[PDB]
């Protein structure tokens, strides 16, 4: 799911933009169990493309979503960035980078 | 979720047009736990706007929806009308008045 | 859900192509409780038209769906074929005939 190079990066990323706690292995195990509960293939966490497919599957549920659902989305958003060689310090940067790249793909449409 | 003025009208609203059973607090407690079960923030039941968002989230599931889902939609549909200060006698009136606004 | 003539057909269909295990009553019980769990009316399993609506509702979840979700879709696809009196030997033939029927 994460390589050794990906995991040492993962473990430095902060949960909040200026908090002390950082992402850990148990958050990946947690996200993997959450997807099973939602009848989603947890093996999709293994690639950039799988994470991209999951975030698109979950996005329509974000606005009305519980804290559990939003935490799950945020975790997979950070995971997507790690797979993608996108350096992020915190969850918010991961979320910022997904919108500005999803904004770029709109720009690429025309 | 409901103020005292809103809770006062809620308890007079009939489940069926126009049967004996009326909405109570236990219907709100139930709907809130059902939303948690479907990973929906039950805190959206506190406002008119939150209820509209849930109703739009649930709308596409209605045609194939279980009895549990249709009851849940009906309960928050009545809850939306109370928040909007729309007087309704029964669930079916709540469903129509929500439909006439969605048309506009 | 199934008549006796349909149940005689159901119990001959193999889970996997030329495998040994065959569909049984418990797979219908499972699919029905699995649908309630996802807020889908299990009463739609009783007709060809109901199964097609369920399949259409489940379709967008297939690409990211777990093995549990695909297993549910596959069981209802076979049930559709039995209702529609389409002869299938196994789950894959059911899936192929539903795809080729939507192509026409």
From TrEMBL, chains B, C:
Residues 1-104 form the Immunodeficiency lentiviral matrix N-terminal domain. Coiled coil: none annotated. GO terms for molecular function: structural molecule activity. One of its GO terms (biological process) is viral process. It comes from the Viruses. This is Gag protein. The lineage of its organism: Viruses, Riboviria, Pararnavirae, Artverviricota, Revtraviricetes. The chain holds residues 7 to 110 of 150 of the full protein.
């Amino acid at each position: 799911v994460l390589s050794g190079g990906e995991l040492d990066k993962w473990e430095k990323i902060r949960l909040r933009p200026g908090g002390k706690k950082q992402y850990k292995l148990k958050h990946i195990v947690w996200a993997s169990r959450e997807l099973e509960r939602f009848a989603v293939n947890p093996g999709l966490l293994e690639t950039s493309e799988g994470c991209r497919q999951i975030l698109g599957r979950l996005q329509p549920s974000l606005q009305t979503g519980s804290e559990e659902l939003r935490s799950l989305y945020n975790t997979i958003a950070v995971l997507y960035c790690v797979h993608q060689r996108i350096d992020v310090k915190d969850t918010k940067e991961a979320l910022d980078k997904i919108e500005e790249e999803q904004n770029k793909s709109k720009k690429k449409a025309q």
